[PDB]
């Protein structure tokens, strides 16, 4: 629906979608690449 | 409930007392000369049962 997508694009719904996606990204990075203090690639 | 005993006689007397208080001088439509509905007799018999259990399971604790 056009109005359902208009609501999904609203600032809080899109903010929680964006930050859930982002948080999953950083979470899976800190699980696959945990305990990181220094960038060792071309160090 | 083993009719003829003290509990049963007391209960019937209390129920009939409350029904009598209802029919004559109160305290399911026109089917009695005094306007005594099925709900009215239900109420009067239920409160009769209340007072009957109270006086019966109690004449039990102290006395009878």
């Amino acid at each position: 629906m056009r109005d359902l997508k208009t609501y999904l694009s609203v600032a809080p719904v899109l903010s929680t979608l964006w930050f859930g996606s982002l948080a999953g990204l950083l979470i899976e990075i800190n699980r696959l690449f945990p305990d990181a203090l220094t960038f060792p690639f071309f160090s | 409930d083993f009719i003829g005993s003290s509990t049963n006689l007391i209960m019937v007397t209390s129920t009939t007392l409350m029904l009598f208080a209802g029919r004559f001088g109160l305290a399911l439509q026109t089917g009695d000369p005094a306007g005594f509905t099925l709900a009215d007799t239900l109420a009067c018999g239920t409160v009769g049962h209340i007072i009957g259990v109270g006086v019966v399971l109690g004449l039990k604790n102290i006395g009878a």
Binding site: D3, L4, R31 | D1, A39, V53
Partner: protein, 742 residues
Amino acid sequence: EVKILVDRDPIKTSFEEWAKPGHFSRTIAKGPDTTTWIWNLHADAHDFDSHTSDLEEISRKVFSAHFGQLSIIFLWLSGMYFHGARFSNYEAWLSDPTHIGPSAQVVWPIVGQEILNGDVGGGFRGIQITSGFFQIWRASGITSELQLYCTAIGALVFAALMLFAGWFHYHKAAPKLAWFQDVESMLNHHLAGLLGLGSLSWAGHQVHVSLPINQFLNAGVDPKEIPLPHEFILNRDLLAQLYPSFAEGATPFFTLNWSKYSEFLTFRGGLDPVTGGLWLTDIAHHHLAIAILFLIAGHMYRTNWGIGHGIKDILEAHKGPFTGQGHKGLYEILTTSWHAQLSLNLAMLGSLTIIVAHHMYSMPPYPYLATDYATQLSLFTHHMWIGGFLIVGAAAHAAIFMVRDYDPTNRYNDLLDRVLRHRDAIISHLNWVCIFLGFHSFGLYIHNDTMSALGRPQDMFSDTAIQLQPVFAQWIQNTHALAPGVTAPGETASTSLTWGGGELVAVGGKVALLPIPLGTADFLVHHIHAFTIHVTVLILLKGVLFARSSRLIPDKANLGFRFPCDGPGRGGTCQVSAWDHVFLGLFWMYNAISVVIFHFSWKMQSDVWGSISDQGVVTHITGGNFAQSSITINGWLRDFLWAQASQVIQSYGSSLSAYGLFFLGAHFVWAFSLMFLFSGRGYWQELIESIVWAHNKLKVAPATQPRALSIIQGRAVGVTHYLLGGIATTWAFFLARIIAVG
């Protein structure tokens, strides 16, 4: 008379209004010229009395909103029962509940937070919960994890049902106003039908399921060996082997030979010494009697038939001599206003939450609750806080009634007018007794502090220097200890063991609620509690009464319930609004409940809780340092705050480390709140306009104009961050303190 008046398809189910935010209000359903708009979109979201003027749509909105709340609570209970089923040690906690920490939450190993999954016990790594769900489940005879998963699925089902119910009762077939206004039937049903039949059905569970299962669980039986609950329903021989009165069935019941039911419907008051909780045999009889009582109470109000009290006929019957017409009109200001009812129900539900807190520590109703000191402390504290909040909201909604729904022309009341007439007398005597109590409860602490600092401990108000013994409370205590006897025969013991003549319920190594001795410190702190309650009532009652008019603002109702001020005139008239009065009463409720739960924690850890060795020598958690240190503020700072905050701050690298983390964080959020309570909007608007210049310099000027928070919004943010921070500080401190030394 009463009916099912309900109209179909009033509102269309469509996302069209989701797409248009702020549709509910006129000024909000045109666009965000400013940023305050979004704060007004959430602020007025559930202010249905301001959206519409007719009570029918408001009643439908709040009815379906209650359905959403019940969906939420069913989903929450689904989560709790599920997490118990899958992520818990409940199946192991039943074996050794006096030594295994009840845990129902496990964290994910990602960033080192897997330290939170600690050695709760039971071969299980998780978080030691303090909710008491495990204690309920032992009281519900669960003895499994399958039953918990099934309960979670059924609760999810009921959540979806309530969601569908809200949708149906707003959009598909919404009741009209004649349906809600029939409060006679509503009370007849909620008394008899919700509370009567609910307590009856729980008595059925308690008799058939909890009692026989706990008869084995307490008798050293492993949960895997216990017969399932339905086996008591299918096979009555197994149920009768412990309670032979079931072999006779309901013939003892219907023949009124109840004397042969005492095997499972008891009056032996006190705590089950095998587990520390109340006798489930007594709780079954309890809920049964409550069923009888609410069932006869829900046949009180006339609904359709000639019998029953019309509540108008009760209220109009009470008309005082010099109190005027009396209670006439109240049926019309309670049935034509949701805010009045909301205030009344909030006040009573909150004081009831507090009474729950008070009766759940002194008569532990669940097995292994009194020995789970974390659960006991957390539950008391929780319900106390909920009660304070509900009372403060009752004030807010009384004020909202007085501003909006109060109409002396149409919906007149006499007693409310009489209260408004001499409101200055009420508030003057309350403002006096608050000062009197403040002095003679806290200045006593100051006196003790000074006398102890001047080296004059013979001049304090202590149990050693100057006796301020609670003579009245001591008399009630001693006569409730000696109550089993002439006054209350057939009880076999006291109804509680929080009285001096009682005894100690040793459960395992723990002590579980021996008597509580009342000394001078209890006098002082109880008058501190009366003081804080009286000041909260001062603030809140003052806001309610002067919500409409004062000598300062005689047209305050036209300004609204929720307004900041009426300018710097009159010397300044900030916070004349009832909203601001309840915003202050929030802080005073916080101080009140904080000192209350401090009194609870310290009096319990010093005079009640502890550990009793097999020789009988009970050693308390602190060492009985309440009556000597709780007479001066330096003891609360030293022996309670400083000392008992040696397990929340030393919990770094432990399983209790999120507690110290939220200790510091809630500290922070409280202090952060002080940025809002202390400051004002104008500074922040000027700063925002400066950084908006910095943005417009870079073509980053947002169209939703950045506005500093409204004044009332700054006050709301301040009070909520302040309360959240103080309360999470206290929550972390209590939970870490009481889980560590346990």
